[PDB]
Each structure stands twice: as C-alpha cells, then as structure tokens.
Design a protein around this ligand. Sequence first.
Ligand SMILES: Nc1ncnc2c1ncn2[C@@H]1O[C@H](COP(=O)(O)OP(=O)(O)O)[C@@H](O)[C@H]1O
Ligand SMILES: Nc1ncnc2c1ncn2[C@@H]1O[C@H](COP(=O)(O)OP(=O)(O)O)[C@@H](O)[C@H]1O
Ligand SMILES: Nc1ncnc2c1ncn2[C@@H]1O[C@H](COP(=O)(O)OP(=O)(O)O)[C@@H](O)[C@H]1O
Lengths: 406, 431, 425, 207, 42
Amino acid sequence: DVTRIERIGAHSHIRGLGLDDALEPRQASQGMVGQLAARRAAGVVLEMIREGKIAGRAVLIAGQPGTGKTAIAMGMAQALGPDTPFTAIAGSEIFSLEMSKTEALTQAFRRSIGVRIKEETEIIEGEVVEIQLTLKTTEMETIYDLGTKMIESLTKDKVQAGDVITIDKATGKISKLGRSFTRARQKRKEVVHTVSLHEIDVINSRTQGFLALFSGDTGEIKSEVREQINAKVAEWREEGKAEIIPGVLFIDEVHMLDIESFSFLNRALESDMAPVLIMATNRGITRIRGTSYQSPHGIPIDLLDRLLIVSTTPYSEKDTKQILRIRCEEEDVEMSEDAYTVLTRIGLETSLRYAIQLITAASLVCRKRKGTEVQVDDIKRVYSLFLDESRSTQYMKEYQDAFLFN
Amino acid sequence: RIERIGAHSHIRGLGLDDALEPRQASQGMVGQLAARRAAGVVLEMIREGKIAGRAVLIAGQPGTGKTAIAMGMAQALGPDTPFTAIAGSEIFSLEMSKTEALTQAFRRSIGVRIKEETEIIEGEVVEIQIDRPSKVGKLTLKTTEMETIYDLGTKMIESLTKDKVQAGDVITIDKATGKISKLGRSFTRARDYDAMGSQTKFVQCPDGELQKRKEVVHTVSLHEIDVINSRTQGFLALFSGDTGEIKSEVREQINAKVAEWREEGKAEIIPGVLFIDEVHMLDIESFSFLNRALESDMAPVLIMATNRGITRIRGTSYQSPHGIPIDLLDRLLIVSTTPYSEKDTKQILRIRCEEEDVEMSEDAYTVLTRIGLETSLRYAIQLITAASLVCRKRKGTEVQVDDIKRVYSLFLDESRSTQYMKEYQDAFLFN
Amino acid sequence: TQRIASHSHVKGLGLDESGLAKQAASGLVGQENAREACGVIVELIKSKKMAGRAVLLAGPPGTGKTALALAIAQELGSKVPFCPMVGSEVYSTEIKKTEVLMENFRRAIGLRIKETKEVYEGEVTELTPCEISHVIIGLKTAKGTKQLKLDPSIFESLQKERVEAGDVIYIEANSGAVKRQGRCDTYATEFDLEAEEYVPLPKGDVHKKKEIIQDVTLHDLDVANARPQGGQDILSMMGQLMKPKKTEITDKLRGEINKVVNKYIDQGIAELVPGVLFVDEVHMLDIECFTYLHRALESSIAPIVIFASNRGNCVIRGTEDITSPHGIPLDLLDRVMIIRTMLYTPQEMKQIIKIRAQTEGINISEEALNHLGEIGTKTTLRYSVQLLTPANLLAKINGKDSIEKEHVEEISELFYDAKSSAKIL
Amino acid sequence: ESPSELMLTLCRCGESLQDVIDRVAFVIPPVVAAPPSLRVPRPPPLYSHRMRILRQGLREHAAPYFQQLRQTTAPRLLQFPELRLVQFDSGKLEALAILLQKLKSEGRRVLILSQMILMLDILEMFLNFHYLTYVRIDENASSEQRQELMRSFNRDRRIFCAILSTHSEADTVVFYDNDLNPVDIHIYRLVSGNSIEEKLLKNGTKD
Amino acid sequence: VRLQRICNHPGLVEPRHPGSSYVAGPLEYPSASLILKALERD
Ligand SMILES: Nc1ncnc2c1ncn2[C@@H]1O[C@H](COP(=O)(O)OP(=O)(O)O)[C@@H](O)[C@H]1O
Ligand SMILES: Nc1ncnc2c1ncn2[C@@H]1O[C@H](COP(=O)(O)OP(=O)(O)O)[C@@H](O)[C@H]1O
Ligand SMILES: Nc1ncnc2c1ncn2[C@@H]1O[C@H](COP(=O)(O)OP(=O)(O)O)[C@@H](O)[C@H]1O
C-alpha cells in the first residue's frame, strides 16, 4: 500500500512515556510496560533535561541483554519532541580514518548542544499581473524608485497572470515563494532557527563550510575558532540577541570504547558547555578495551565513579503476554488465544526476539492458508521450519565435525 | 634485443604431440610427463573457452620447473589471448584495498575485441592549389589504375595546410574523420628541387580504387575500459596507475553495456588467463574474497603455485596443506611434480649448454651432473656459465673437469656455507 | 552463447503453488525444508511492508547456500533491487567501514520516478548576442521556426559547440546539456571532401516534453548531492577538478534526503521499492562490524538482510579470544533467523550430476555416472563437478563422443583431491 | 632533458589516443545535482563585498584558460546509438547495403520506392549513415516543386540516389512495399518473407 | 497495420530512445545573517 520512507520499525510501537503527571508509572501505555523503577528514573532524567540548569551530567543504563534499553532511550527521545537537539550514535561510528579520534568525540559533543534564535523581516507585495517600476497592485500600488538587477530580471521573469510571489518590498530581492492574494485567485513573523556549535564553527571555518556540512569532509578544525566562537556565543547570550536551548546526546555500546576515549570523556565532561549525556551497555564484568583489565562492564573505575547507573530486570509471564499482544495488534495480526498462550510460553523459554519474529511469519503462513486467524498448528510448523539459538547450537554440535574449527 | 639470456629463456612451449603425449624433448622441455599431459589438457580447455571459473594448483618440490611449466604454457598460448602473471606479495599496497587489487587483476586478464568498418581513400598528390583570400582549394589524386580530381574542404584546407604535405606525395584520408596520414613519398614527390631540402626513399604508387571501405579491429581489457570511463579524464591515470576504489556501480554498468554489445555481433570477448605465484603469500581475507570471485561470469582461469606442506594459514595459527583453507581446496584440482631422475638431468644440462653456446667435455658432463644431483640442479645451472668464463680465461675452448673443480671450490654452496657457519658459529650474530 | 558458470543451472526455487518443494524442479533437489523456508522469505519480502527483518543460513560447506540466495533472486524477478557482497570488501583505504556498510544499506533500496523533462533542438538559424543575457537563438525545423531568449551559460555552451548555422543541435532546458549533431543535410553538396558529416532537419517541433519511468537508488541520490558536479559556477568547477576521493557522508544529509523523498512521494509521482542485501562470509567481519550492525538493523528503513557462514564455534574476528557459534557474536546471533542445511546421499548426487551434464550438454555412459557418484561419495561434490570438462576433452580428443569409465579413471590419476594430496604430502 | 618521444598507444592495434577514447566513453551518472545554496535573511554587505571580490578574482586569472578548463569536467549526460542498430532492427537495410554498394560500384542514379512517410525519414538516416547523396520526394510539396526537384535531379548528376513518395528520369529503382492501386533495372522487392509474408503478396483477393 | 511495422522496421514503432540522468533540484538551508554580524572585530 502507500508507504513513506519509514516502515514498520523494530521499536515503532513506542510513541511517548507511560508516565503519570506526578512522574509516576501507569502499568501499560504509550506502547511500553513494566520496568517501573527505570521508568521513574527516566522521568526524573527527562525533567532534568527540561530544566537544563545543570551542565553536563551523565547517566548510564545497564541490564542483561533483551531488556530494551534502546526502547527506553527512544521513548525519552519522543518525550523530548521535535524542539530540542538529540543525537544517537553507536560505538563503532567513532572510529573514522578521515579525522583524528578526540576530534570525532569533540565534534559529536559540539553537535549535540543547540542554540535557538528568532528573527523578523518586513515583506509586502502588490498584485502585479504584468511581468515588467509599474508595480501593478490591487491593494495599493507603488512606483517606487527602480533598481537595475530588478529591472533587467523581473522583466524577463516567467510567471502566470495575477501571480504574486512574496517579493521583498523592503529589499526588492526576487523571492519566488509567495502566492497571489487575489490577482491570480506582510507578516514580519519570528523566523525561528535551530543551530548547534558544530554548525556555527563549520560555517565560519571557511568560505563555504556549509558544503563541508553535507560532504562530511572537514577534519580537525583548530581549537582557536572553537574557543572564539564559544566567547561569541556567550557574549550574545548576555546581550539577549540570542538564546541557548541545551540539547542532549545518546551513545550506545560504550563497552566498545578505547581507554583513551574514557579518559577524554572524563576530562570533557568537566567542561562548561557540555550537553547532558546518556549511555548504554549490557555485559557485567568484562575486559577493558586495549588491555587485559577486567572491569565492571569493561569501564574504567574512575569513569564509573563519576557516573550513575540504573538497572533493568527480566520480564515476567504476564509482562511477556502484554508485550506480545501489544506488538501483535501493532502488526495488525489476530490470533486464537490458545495461540497467544502457547506462543507466550515458547517466548518465555526462548527469548523475546524469537516471538516478536515468529508473529509475522505466522501471519504470512496463515495468509497462504488463506485464513485470517492463526492457530497453534501454524506456529508449531513455523517453529519447526526455523530455529532458535539453542536448537541451532545443538544441531551444530551433532555436525560439529562438518563445521570447520569444531 | 632488450631481452637477455634468462633462466627460462630455453623454454619455448610444452613439447606435446597432437594426442598430447609429451615428447622426450621439444621446444626446450622434457620431464614430469604426467604434468605435461595435465598442462596440455588445460591448454586445450582454454582454447575451448566454453566454461568459466575453473581453477587449478601446482605443488611439488621447490626449484622443479613449476615456473618453467607456467612459462611454457604462456609461450604456447600465443599473444592473441590475454595473459598476466603476478606475485602474491604485490597485491599488498598502500593505495587501495586488497579486494580492489584482486578485481583489477581479474579485469586486466580478460580482454575485448572490437570490430568496426572503415571508409578511406589514398593516392598520389597529383596536384594541389590553395587560394588564400575564406580559402578556396582544388586538388587531384590518382593511383596505378586511374586518376581523379576533387574540390577541397575548408576544414580539409586547415588539415592539409597544417600537414604541409608536398604535391606528388602519397597519403590517405578518411572522410568521416578527415584526418590525413603520410604513407611514404613517391618518385616525383621526393624528386624535390635543385635546393637540397632533404633526402628520402620511395614507396610504390597505391593501387585499386581510391575509396576502399575496409574493416578495422581493436582490442582492449575490461579494466582499461573501467579506468578510461571512470573519472572522466582519468585516462592519464592509466599509466600513473593512481586509480583508486573504482566504484561498483561503474562495474555493473560496464558489464551490462558490454554484454549487450556482445550478443549483437558488435564485438567478441576472450577469456584470458591469470597466474599468481607464491599464492601462499595471501592472507585469509584474499582467500575469502577470491573464493566468490570465481562465480562472476568474467572469470579467467586461475593457476597457482606453492610447494608448502601443512603450513600455518597466513594471518592465523592454522596449519593446512600448503596453507590454503579447505574451502578453496575443494574448489580446485592439483598437479604434482616429482624430483628429476639421472639421465633426464643430463638432457636438461645439455639443453642449457646449447642455450649458452658453450660445448665442453663428456667427463665434465658426468661429474657436473652427479654434483648437481647431490646438491641441487640450480647450483649446477649457476656453475655452467662460471665454468665457461674460467675456461675462456684459460684461453682454451673445451672446459675441463679440473676447471669445474676449481670453480666449485671458488664458490661454496648452500651445504658448504652452512658447514662453514658451523666451522665458526660465533662469526655472525643472532644464531 | 556466453560462458556457463557453476551456478548457472539454477533458475527457480522449484516450489509448488501450494507452498511445498517439488523434488525435481528449476534445478534443485532435496532440502525441502530449506526450499519451503526460502518460499516463506520470498513471500515476506513480497509483502513489501516489513522492514528490518534479517535471516542467516548455515550448514556443511558446499551445500548451495549461495545457490539458495541465487534462486531467491531468480524467483524475485527483476523489479525488486538486489545486492551481493562479502565480508572482505568491508575493509577500505578510503573511508571507514561503518560508512561502507551504510552506503550498502542505502543502495539496497530502490526508487522509481516519472519525470517531465523539456527539450529544445532544431537547425541553428541565427545567434544574436544582445545585452549576454539577451542571446536570442533562431531555430529552424520542418515544423517551422522560433527564436527565444537564452541563458549566458547556454551561450557559452554554444560557443564551445562550434556551431554557426545550418547545423543541428540539441538543448535540454533542465540540465542545460548542450550538444551538436553535425551539420544539416541541406549542405550535402557545397563541397565534395569537406570532413564533417551531415544529418537532416528534425521532423518534429522544436519543443517537446516526454515522461519517463526513471529508477535510482537512495545511495545514488546521496552521492550525487554530496559532490555537486552539477552547477557551473567557477567555485563549483574548481571543487570538481579536485581529486575524486570518496568521503564519509554526514547523517544530516541523510535526514534531509529522507524528508525530500517523502515530499516527492506525497506528490504521488514516485513509488518506492525496497531491495534485499546478501552478505557472504559474514564471519570475516570484525567485532566492530557486528556492533554497528546491532544499531543499523534497528532503523525503520533498513531492508531485509541475509548472511552466510560455513564454520563452527571458533574464535571471533577482531576478538582473537572469544569463540562463538559460527564465529558470529552470540548477541547478534540472538537477533536473526536461522536456517540450516543437511547433507546428501549417492542418489541425490546422481540427480545433480544428470542436471549438470544437461546444463553443459554432454552424452555420458551410465557406468561413468555410477563411478562418478561413487567418487563424489568419497570426495566433495565440487570435486565431482569439476571432473566434467576434462572428461569431455578426453572423449573429444580420442574421437569418441560419450564419456566412459576409462576417461573417468584417467582423469582420476591425472588430478587428485585435497585429502589425497595431504595423505601423499 | 627532453626525451618526450611520444605518448605510445595503449595496445589499441595501431591507431590510438582518440578512437579508443570516443569508442569506450559512454558512462552517464544516474543522478546530477546542483550545489547547495545557503538561505539567509538580509546578509551583511561586508561578506557580500568579500565574496564578490573573490568572484572577480577567479576570472581573468582563469579567463585565458577558463575556456580550456570548461571543455573538461562536463560529464556526458546522454548518448545516441547510431544506425549500427539497423543491424538488429531491419534485415532490409543491412541486406540491401551490399547491392547498393554494387550499384555505387556501377554508377547508375537510383530512385527508391516506399509508402510510409516515416520510413522515408528512416531511410534518410540510412543514406546519411552510408555517406551517399539523397533527394526527398513527398506529397506535401506542390507540383512546381515536384518539377523543380526533377530539374535538380536531371541538371545535377552529383546526386546519386533518390527516394519517391508512393503517391505518384533514370534507370535504377526497386519496389519496396505493397498496395492495391495500379499506381534493364532489376527489381528486388523488399520482401523479408520467410513465413506467410509470401502468401501476403501472392493473391491479393477478397479471401 | 501491425504487419508492415515489423516486416519493415521495429524502430518504426517503440523508437529507440537515448537515456539520461535525473536533474535533482537544488538544496536549500535556512539560517540567520547574524552568523556573520560578529567575528569581524577589526
Ligand atoms: N521490551 C523490549 N522492546 C524492544 N526491544 C527489546 C525489549 N527487550 C529487549 N529488547 C532488545 O534486546 C536487545 C538486547 O538487549 P539490551 O542490549 O539489554 O537492550 P538495549 O539494546 O536497549 O540495551 C536490545 O537491542 C533491545 O532492543
Ligand atoms: N624439466 C625441466 N626442463 C627444463 N628446465 C627446467 C626443468 N625443471 C626446472 N627447470 C629450470 O629450473 C627452474 C626451476 O624453478 P621453479 O621450480 O619453477 O621455481 P619455483 O619453485 O619458484 O616455481 C625453472 O625456471 C627452469 O628454468
Ligand atoms: N539442489 C542442488 N542441486 C544442484 N547443486 C546443488 C544443490 N544444492 C547445492 N548444490 C551445490 O552446491 C554448490 C555451491 O556451494 P556453496 O553454496 O558455495 O557452499 P555453501 O552452501 O557452504 O555456501 C554448487 O556447486 C551446487 O552444485
């Protein structure tokens, strides 16, 4: 059917935060359920973000794999809404041969923050049917002085009869954006823009840094322009000509970070203009990147000390049934409740992902059956034709000899 | 002449009869008769050229003509068929990924032949007159059969006046291109003036009618097409070899266009052959990439060489036969080479002596053959020319076994060198 | 005919409409489980709605996993886009491998566009360069004649076209692409050896605008925008002349492109068509690659991915100490389907041998077939397949046509398997 | 010091350095995009002055070779397969080419026959491709134009071949098509009938 | 009618057409001139 670029997402269901006005949890809403402690902690963190009075605080979310911390982060992002900057990037994007390493994290931070500004401009127009001065108008006509580029340009301009672009009366620039008030058939406004320091610096860096924005080419901009633009931003804040809206940042798989990365993070967090930061990682005690040190989640102890943690817990049976039903209706698939129960069992033994996977396969199998309701037989057949982690591991273990190195 | 007598200059083919029975001596080769049989089959199948992606490996003792077998193959193949030999260590480069390098080699191996009709005329410059004021021009030509007279084009006028051709000369012009070429002066043309000017030879007047149509054919490799059309003035990079990361969309676009040109008689493809030496020098990444590199239709046959046995996989700690993962191993067949016999060695050394054009004593042959057998063939090959030089210093012609012993004493061998190093282990550091 | 590869017989999954796997069809045999599973996957993609699902294959080496992917492609028709690659190509000397993966994902999807386009051509009558901007060009065609204002850019283009009058050109307003078609055919007699060719006056109107079903990938949209070869300003020209080095693409460009494509779809002109991405030897990927795959598969726009591996629980690339089943990290393994593969028996070998022999069209003795099946039972199947061409050459050289046991044994002592070498090494 | 022998051919069978280039170069990008232009409200006149000064500087400096540079980095946008297509399009033109070459060897003026108007344009393409003369006969032309065309034919022998509109002097013509109305040369009809296209010319009756 | 087209020339119908590339529209970016009002102390 008609589709946009986006399609059914792995975590599309969420749309917000199942949170009470008092930062308290409601058992099921907004596409997410359970994990109430993390829910309240995330509400508190989001309230911190809204206030934004503190500078560069950091938090981390732990928990065994499967617990949808990314789900929580995306819920946070939706709760923030399309008004404040938010940046999400996995751990491996940090390694880029184009630029150095510290440069990449510094650019990430300077991109996360956000500066807002509103501006005004008077623009009025007259309904000029003839494209040729004689600024033909229906409201009030003008024969104001004549330029040169405007005269030689508007005369040869191609426009329909009665059409009236919102031309710049204050300037005369040919701004082909507006339409005809009545000829074919004014507001100074407050044009509001969102910008980050990663934008200002690159714009001022050279003649056409805006090209470098899209090209993703610039590397290692000197810290001098950075500090000068920080001073400029501060002295614009003081004078009221500009305002700041401190954004946020998200990272994932921080376990896959070098020790130098952690040290640079420890320094940079100390800075003033640091947007709030959020983390994510699953494993428990593990080796740190670059050495043999086993550390909790493979994070340096000093970095952990200056950081907070929040945990998650597995899903009970009825929690699993709730998630299953919400994602089953989300995909628009309707089951026989015996199928719901048997699938819920299976999901409890195997995993959450396996069930979220099997639902659509069962739907298609039934479509081939030509019915609209899937029963246990179809699910058992699907589970027979495709395998989970444990079953595949075993099957290898019978064919271990066939598979090389085993 | 730029060439020089090389270790493998004596090779001129494979010495196989029509039934592919190897001949005990032919175009400078004898031995490994089973290997000669297999190689003949391979060459036959290459001529068939009906299949793609086949691969084969040659293993055996070191210094047993494996390279010689490959070179005899390449010689017998002929120049028409494209060919290319490279070394494993050469792919490792600081300009490009290894996979791009392997793709470049593959595409280099394959070739394309383009056929296209022509349209040209040629004859004596019977007479010309140019009439600068634009320029009006009149001209005539002829041949050994008749004569003709034509007007002159303004762009033809510029072309010729830049050519500065002299009346009476013999030249050829193509109408579509309008580009002229001098094909050698004629009796009246180079009769010249009393004034010196120059001196030159002559050519015979052309024949047949002026107009001749005629068809021209060309040949180019896939990688050449890729590079030339890649950067849009990446053409000069062909020599500089600075091509980097030739994108994949270009590959597929060229593949489509070449296929469609192919099935329409526009041109004919030719499956080339690619040989890689010291194949064990490849890491596991290259093994993985090339393992699939054979499915693409544009797959020249591959030939590999390595003598290892149960060696660590390059880049890992895994011993495998010749250090090549079994996945590839099951995708190709093998040929083995045995160490040579006694009398065959005599034949080989006599052939090399013929190569060097130095003819000497029979006792020398016996003694040198036995010495080489005991030590190696390669040391005997080294001693050949050394003994020749010593004997010429004696001012005689027939090298004598005493001279052979002299030279042998002069230049210690591998076994003697290690025996010496033993004579004083502490001579050289890091033992 | 064009050459024939190992995987050329494959033409279709060989299933039946009911959803079952016929034993013999479209060049496939056995593995009914795998064939029906591939049927399920092809139906899933035919849904054209699901995004982000992923699958993996496994089994004994040389069981046709590549063949399964190829047969999926066969039954998928041509409309849907497709893309293969391998773990090895992820490593590059131009940009980070993360960007390589993201570019692959971008080009997996396809797009189809119905495009206006406006053309202008004819015979050059006049060229009056009045005041640069006022460059009016008079064009003659069989229909008639017109003369219109010009852009000094196209003026320079015409200058470089070396055209005055009585010659044919071709102007497209959108691209501004300027082009010459030689000289008019009217002047086919003025001279006799004038070099430049001649073509006749156009038989249509000077103006014409025709629609076209153009198709492009989102990757190409991104790249075309990134390095603006378009435009003609001298600053742009200088940007162009610099060396063509590929650069990592900022994601803001990606987001803006997504927005613009949404607007285009809202115009109803363009319709989307996602593709399927096949990756071979995924084990060759490192730990970082799987780390980035974890996030990459999450996107709402990621097409369907496939993988392949023929390895047991061995050490993990880029990890060098941890061992995981097939070498793929257990966490990523948790995110994917699994489809397995069996082994075969002598009868199946005979079947596939007959299929291949037909594929290359060679008569053979049934006894040779029996012996070759025995060999394949001993050896690997690929070894059995490789023997066909030498047997055919033996048959042809000796003057006979069908292959017999003597030729089979001859090839046998000519060439040997890996295990044979090892035991004799 | 200055060997500069010559840029040797890259194994192109004799000729090279342009024919390979213009034979191989065909690639077109799928997409072409304009440079991004930043949108700003009223900008400072100082930046405008500096950028305009740069715009002045770029030329003059580039002017002498601006043209030469402009010929390059103008990637091709489209192509036009020649009548070489005729190979796989119609056996008529390819099959006749040989006999037309024979006739040009002889040297009789040859008028050609056909009925479809657009086939005349296609045959004109064919003529141009073979580098021969031509003259068009249609029905939109008036009678005085017809007789002027005959005068051009007869007075001028430079032309070698001609085409006739089916509606209505030399010694070389050959029929091309079929019709129902009545209105030493050898007439080799353009009948590529290896099928019912023979009976298609045989009876011509109500049945 | 459709006999003669093929019998004589297939290009007479479905005339072969030369392809081209898409001319994407230009890309724009909003901003404020204040980005440059300062940074020119002088
Ligand atoms: N309820 C859930 N909703 C969505 N995804 C989940 C859920 N539970 C587990 N997962 C998924 O399991 C994967 C591995 O678990 P984990 O890494 O703990 O989650 P996260 O990626 O959020 O940190 C995650 O990518 C997460 O998306
Ligand atoms: N049977 C033979 N006939 C003629 N020349 C031979 C023969 N065997 C070896 N040679 C010579 O000795 C050399 C053997 O070297 P080779 O074993 O090919 O090196 P590699 O071990 O690197 O392949 C060849 O270059 C060839 O010139
Ligand atoms: N049903 C089948 N019919 C014929 N050949 C098959 C079949 N299944 C597998 N094969 C063989 O498998 C080989 C391809 O193996 P490949 O897919 O590369 O190994 P893997 O399956 O381990 O990736 C082909 O040579 C093909 O002949």
